[PDB]
Amino acid sequence: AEVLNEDFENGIPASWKTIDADGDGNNWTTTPPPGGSSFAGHNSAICVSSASYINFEGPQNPDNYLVTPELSLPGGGTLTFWVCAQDANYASEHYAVYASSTGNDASNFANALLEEVLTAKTVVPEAIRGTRAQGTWYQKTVQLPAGTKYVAFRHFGCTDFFWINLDDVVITSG
Ligand SMILES: [Ca+2]
Ligand SMILES: [Ca+2]
Ligand code: NA
Ligand code: NA
Ligand code: NA
Q: Which of 27, 33, 72, 144 could link 18 by a cystine bridge, Cβ 3.0 to 4.6 Å?
């Protein structure tokens, strides 16, 4: 039974929450600057994205969370989602996925269930990035413990690549 299935085609839903932990005003977003329109989604128009580098601005130091609405997983569940680097040639974005059994603030998200740096399969030094191919979309699977109330996706601990993209977040109970 699916308890969450988000394609982002109507943007980040109001039921989800962004946390700008570094405080720069830049978040996970479906309107990445300076274009202000979503990057190409996974077999779809829209995905949600966070920047380590913004064209016409420069390197960023993100600590950005994207948090689900409150979940009921009394016996646990399974998360799947799709992730890619927006620029296949500046691919090395660092992210983690966390579960909380209580609240939905940054301090509630500790002990990553998954933490990785996307694999660079190709590389280029350019001021304007995102000018070639998107990275490959990869599906990830994370098991969620019983009593998980919130899942957070965190883009952090990296700078000076381009953007990380997320799409097609599905959580099933059991
Ligand atoms: Ca989508
Ligand atoms: Ca930020
Ligand atoms: Na949906
Ligand atoms: Na919200
Ligand atoms: Na709260």
A: 27
